[PDB]
Amino acid sequence: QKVILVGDGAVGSSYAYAMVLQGIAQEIGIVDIFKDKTKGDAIDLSNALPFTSPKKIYSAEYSDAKDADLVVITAGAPQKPGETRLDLVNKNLKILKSIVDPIVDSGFNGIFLVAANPVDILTYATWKLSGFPKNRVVGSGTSLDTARFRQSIAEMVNVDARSVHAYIMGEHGDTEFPVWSHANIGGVTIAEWVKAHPEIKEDKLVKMFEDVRDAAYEIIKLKGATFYGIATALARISKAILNDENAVLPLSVYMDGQYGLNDIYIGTPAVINRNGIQNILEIPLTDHEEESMQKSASQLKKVLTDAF
Amino acid sequence: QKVILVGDGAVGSSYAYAMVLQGIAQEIGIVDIFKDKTKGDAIDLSNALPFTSPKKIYSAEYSDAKDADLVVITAGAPQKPGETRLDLVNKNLKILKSIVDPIVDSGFNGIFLVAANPVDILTYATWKLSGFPKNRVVGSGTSLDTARFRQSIAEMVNVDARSVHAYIMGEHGDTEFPVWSHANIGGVTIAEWVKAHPEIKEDKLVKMFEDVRDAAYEIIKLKGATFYGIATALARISKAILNDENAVLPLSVYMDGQYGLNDIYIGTPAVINRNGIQNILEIPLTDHEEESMQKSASQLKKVLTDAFAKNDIETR
Amino acid sequence: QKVILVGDGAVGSSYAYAMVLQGIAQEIGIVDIFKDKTKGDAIDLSNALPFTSPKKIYSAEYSDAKDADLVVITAGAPGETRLDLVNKNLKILKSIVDPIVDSGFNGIFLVAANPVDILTYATWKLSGFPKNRVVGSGTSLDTARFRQSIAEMVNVDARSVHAYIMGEHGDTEFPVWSHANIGGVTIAEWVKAHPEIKEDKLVKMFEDVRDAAYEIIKLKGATFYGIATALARISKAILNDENAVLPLSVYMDGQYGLNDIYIGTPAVINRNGIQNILEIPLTDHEEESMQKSASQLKKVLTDAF
Amino acid sequence: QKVILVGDGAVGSSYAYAMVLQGIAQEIGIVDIFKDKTKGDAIDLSNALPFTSPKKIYSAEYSDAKDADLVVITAGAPGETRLDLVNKNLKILKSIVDPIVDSGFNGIFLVAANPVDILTYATWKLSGFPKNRVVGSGTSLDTARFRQSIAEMVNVDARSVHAYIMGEHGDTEFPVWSHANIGGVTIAEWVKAHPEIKEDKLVKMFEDVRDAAYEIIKLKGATFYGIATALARISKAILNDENAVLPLSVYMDGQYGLNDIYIGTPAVINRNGIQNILEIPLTDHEEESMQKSASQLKKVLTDAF
Incomplete structure (x- = not known):
């Protein structure tokens, strides 16, 4: 290794x-x-x-x-x-x-x-x-943000993070988004968890995502750069690969139809082992969320076109 | 602790x-x-x-x-x-x-x-x-069987067990059941997984659930008793309680309306910590699985009422 | 593995x-x-x-x-x-x-x-x-437990507690009190500095450690968790090539003046078996203890074959 | 915590x-x-x-x-x-x-x-x-790196390598070679039975450990991972009340012949601070090294005020 x-x-x-x-x-x-x-x-x-x-x-x-x-x-x-x-x-x-x-x-x-x-x-x-x-x-x-996102939901809802299933997909950055519709805690949808626990306000969840998405900007503002978080997630990914783990992590994988996207790398759940990506998971998206994924990919795709 | x-x-x-x-x-x-x-x-x-x-x-x-x-x-x-x-x-x-x-x-x-x-x-x-x-x-x-159930699905699909979500609920025993409709791999349903990965045969999956559920039987017939699996499961639960984890486990919890059931303990995913059950998760079920739940629960209630009735009256 | x-x-x-x-x-x-x-x-x-x-x-x-x-x-x-x-x-x-x-x-x-x-x-x-x-x-097991007990009594993390029980595992095994140390300080010297520690307590301790198996068998009918864990640790040192020092049963080619018999003493073990056999300096009395243990063993070994 | x-x-x-x-x-x-x-x-x-x-x-x-x-x-x-x-x-x-x-x-x-x-x-x-x-x-970090290096050289798991670098952390710290040991056997004794390990390589190794910090500062500008990792382990011994033995900066009250200064020496630390200051047996020359480091330390400490 x-x-x-x-x-x-x-x-x-x-x-x-x-x-x-x-x-x-x-x-x-x-x-x-x-x-x-x-x-x-x-x-x-x-x-x-x-x-x-x-x-x-x-x-x-x-x-x-x-x-x-x-x-x-x-x-x-x-970027300057x-x-x-x-x-x-x-x-x-x-x-x-x-x-x-x-x-x-x-x-x-x-x-x-x-x-x-x-x-x-x-x-x-x-x-x-x-x-x-x-x-x-x-x-x-978006593995680092997804991890933080899950951890924050976990803290809010008070359930062990290991049982919090949620994903942030798209191009890691300003256009990334949370798949709320599919996100769940131990098998119960976030939607059902809120209906069953009103104290978990919908607006607070929304801000939480925003705080997770904008955090890197905030850190660079105060400290001038961001590294501890990214460094830890980079290590975890490294561990899954080296230990032939077959872990599921929201990585930048090659689109070939999934979500209808083609010929670009974007973020989505994927199985990764000692031989790289084994599977690219297509999580059932709400049509609204499919738009999100759409916007995100087109903006990213354009830049990719130009650069080359 | x-x-x-x-x-x-x-x-x-x-x-x-x-x-x-x-x-x-x-x-x-x-x-x-x-x-x-x-x-x-x-x-x-x-x-x-x-x-x-x-x-x-x-x-x-x-x-x-x-x-x-x-x-x-x-x-x-x-039971002799x-x-x-x-x-x-x-x-x-x-x-x-x-x-x-x-x-x-x-x-x-x-x-x-x-x-x-x-x-x-x-x-x-x-x-x-x-x-x-x-x-x-x-x-x-049903925590042990669920954990063993997940690891086996994991081994078959070749995906880290941590990302394998599947529950075996009901009365721990001959009538417990797997919630196949809801079980999924990293967010993708077992059904959907079988569609994309046909090598994963459904009869083997269902046989595996049977091998899981019947495993305790086979262990007793060959060795006389079972203890390593449950003992290890028990320690995990004990850790969840003692370390106040708020971990989700398919445990025996009191039914107060969930699944249309009332006044009995039955297996279902729950959140447990140092103060006991914090939440009882109601996993969406199929009309049948729901019926399985109702049946598994009626027979259950029957044996309690009988045992307690005899014990309440005949004890001296 | x-x-x-x-x-x-x-x-x-x-x-x-x-x-x-x-x-x-x-x-x-x-x-x-x-x-x-x-x-x-x-x-x-x-x-x-x-x-x-x-x-x-x-x-x-x-x-x-x-x-x-x-x-x-x-x-x-x-x-x-x-x-x-x-x-x-x-x-x-x-x-x-x-x-x-x-x-x-x-x-x-x-x-x-x-x-x-x-x-x-x-x-x-x-x-x-x-x-x-x-x-x-x-004697890896007994030493492990012997060190643990010294640690509790002495109130210092066992990892720094150094002691060995050598000779045939069983009735005739003995503790090397002279070389035994805490953080590098002999037990003897530790006791001077700290009189609260008594030789009666230390002496009975080794005895308890040594005859523990006898009681467990009397109470529960058999002993297994202790040796099981100790075997597991030895198994690890071997399978993971740790070159760890453990009082194992090693072949005697002169050490302590013994020969042609396996007996307990500290040794380095790795994926390829025993790498080294360590000779701890002994006290005349301690040498006797080792001597007596080996002769008693050698006879039984001699009559067995 | x-x-x-x-x-x-x-x-x-x-x-x-x-x-x-x-x-x-x-x-x-x-x-x-x-x-x-x-x-x-x-x-x-x-x-x-x-x-x-x-x-x-x-x-x-x-x-x-x-x-x-x-x-x-x-x-x-x-x-x-x-x-x-x-x-x-x-x-x-x-x-x-x-x-x-x-x-x-x-x-x-x-x-x-x-x-x-x-x-x-x-x-x-x-x-x-x-x-x-x-x-x-x-000198906890240097002692830790010192033990690990001796282990890689002798090819024996570090947990069984006992050595101490004592004195004022700096150019004047020295290795207690006489007392250093492997699983209970002396470095000196170990070398004897293992010719390939030369006292020459061993002296240069210590010196590398001692002046490493200096090389890191020239190459990278600063040193922090080694000291940070070591600090975290000391912090763990304290927060978890471990009663661990670490060469720390402790107040000398006659130990080693020193008085009224903090200096590097093996010690037991826990949730409530320092439990014991260990006095390891030093040779005449190793004792001279301790005095030299301490007297020089004391000098700079006085002028400082």
Whole structure:
């Protein structure tokens, strides 16, 4: 279980730490333009190993991805507060290509996990750039928000989060949405739970989603950047892949008809194991919610068209 | 987190051991009419603690339930061939009564976790005999079979069990049933799953439910008794209660209108915590499954009324 | 990580349950003369799997040990004399080792049958396997409990409590008080600094630890949860290649001045058996204790074959 | 189990993250000059909670230390003169400890800021708290990394590797090689039976552990994951009342021949602070090392005031 991390910034670095404290993977190679930073990170991270399970951590080069089972791409230049997102995508595409090409050439044949924002778009870019099978290229999608969303519903309703089933689908970002109609707690629909427990106000639920959806913006405002949350979810996804888990997570997967969408990566439940996506789940959507999914995909699709 | 286990037999003993190895509970008082066995089981289990989290395990008497947080009743009389299931209830009631009363006398005011068979019947009995609130008396119901049911579906569809939602409800036993219409994988129904994945055959799925439900029978015929599965299920429930989790489990809960049922304990998904049942989930059912529920519940009510009637009048 | 369990009695059964709950090994083949019991036991156990990590459990035959990584021998019937107990278990041991060896099994042997030290020496001779591929539970259990009790009494996390009970597991085993320490401080020195701790308490403690099994048997009819858990830990150290230090039954090639017999002492064990046998410096008295324990054992070993 | 972290820099921030992933404590209030950063940090960390055990994390003020069970001080700037660094951190410390004590805090102090030993003594002086209710990370991390390295070299599970790096955390800390042992066998004795392990590789290993922090700072700019992880483990020993043995910064009352200074030495810590200061048997040279580190420490500690 060898992982090659690409991007030793706030997200990549925190991600490796999470992997270390949580005991996921056996070998982690850190790659970043700035070599010295990663060498230091490797030594520092390694000094924490005596408190967790063993691991081998080192500053690596794209060539070291040859026998890697999972490549995590975090390195993604942030949008300047005064530029087209298209530019953000045009600058990250160059950053991206300079990463995928050299990684492919190493002989790497494992799973790609894209976390760089905008993720859905960059997952399509990675796929197109690598020429890898659709199921071997994945994006963090809306797994982090779905997790938080479930956790918040759980706290409000007071039921163990493990029994709260809800999904946030679409392009991870401003257009993502909650599948309220299908969301349920232990088998009972949120709708039925409210009818049965009026104290759980419908308006508060709605704001909660909004708070989950806008949180990354808020954090960047206060702290300047977001990383702990994304880093933890990135680790979980990494765990499901490496441990051939067959877990169901809302990832950025390749659309081929599901929800009627085609030729794009967007967020939807999916089964993921050591060989990438096994299944792409189509959750019964309300026609209204199908519009949501529709809007979200068209906006994302246009940008994808232009960029290329 | 103090636990008082009544019945140090195969189930009871296995349960304690599970609690020990899994690190659930801080204290475990073992109670059984046979004192020396509980004393040796206490010492024996304590030699395992160095390989797990600490715990205080000792031989106990009902009076020790005074400050307990949980009382686990596994003490039950086996059904020998040739006796009405009515007799099996009659003698188990006598037993239950010899346990409930003294525990209630100690001042115990925690939660009751009934595991004896028939569990639903013995749960309602414990509830009635103790006088405890309906939500402070729970049966292990169909939690084990549901957990085993899910893992098997998981293995067949090859999807992590955590994302496999399926319930087996009704009276734990020969007439419990799987709510196939509502069961789903990560949000996608079993029916829909079979449509997209034809390799997943329906006869195998239904046979698997039968193999699950009949598993206890086969275990007894080959080995004489069953304890590892239920013991492990019991410890999970115990953890849900003691750690105040608000976990959803198909347990034996008091029916007060749900499923059109009233005044009996029967299996159905419920939310449980340190104060007992918090919520009873009403999973949408098919007219038939609903009928199954009604039937499973009528026969249930019949045996209670018979057992309690005989016990109310003939006891001396 | 495939394990073959020979003996589905109270110990074997508990052992597997421990393995199931603790998540050790991915496959357990249970082997016992009573097929039905092993069959129902495998089904009961498997129902416990949804609450733990996955594993494959089934009623096996010695031949299933062909591709097994670990073979644990618990078999053996519990008013008997020990000499005539040893004899009926050497015979049983033979009926197990031979066929397991013929299946091609080139893994590790972990003997738990009693007397362990004697029967462990028997497995070695009966299988031919290298002195380091045949291991006995030794005194790992008693030491684990001995350390735990010192920790409670002393009120310091047991992980830092270092003590060993060595020699033949049983009546003649003894504690190495001289080398035993807390955080690195000898027990002796700890007692000086803290008089609240009494030698009478410490001395009776070892005794209680040592004769515990005797009482559990008297009270409950048999002991199994303790050794089961200890076997499970040993099983883990082997299957996961931990190179852990445990007082196991190891072959004597000079240590403590002993030779050609298995006996209890700290050793490093991993996926490939015992990696190292550790010699703890002993006190003259302690050397005697070890000496006396070994001679008493060696005689019984000598007359057995 | 509530905690008040003072300092939301790379170390405190990472500390909080570790605490969150490892699920230690149920409440963490992050206190730092820059509020918005501690505010956006708490939101960010709270988004990770769904993947771990529950916790209540928030931006706090010194006043929130009132009911706190433990306060962790990581504030303190990272050219520089050993003297100047101490003198300005002593100032920072004063602007923190005072206000925290004013809140009503009657819990434990865990000092992580460097130079840790000196800043720990300062915390004791400034807080007026009991000697046992003021703790410094001391050499716990280096000792932990030191043991792990010896284990990888000797190929024996680290839990069985007992070694101690003592003295003032810094350039003057030294390894107690004489007492260091593996499963009860001495490093010196271990080497004898294992030629391939050379005292040359062993001395260089320690030196790497000691000056590693320095290499990390040059390469990356700062060091935080090692210290943060270690802080979280000490925090766990305290919040869970473990009575764990860790080389911490503790008040010397004659032990080792030292008096009236905090310095690195094995100790038992729990919910109520330091239970015991362990005095490990030092060689003449190892004893000289302790004196040298302490006298030099004492010097810098005096001038500082």
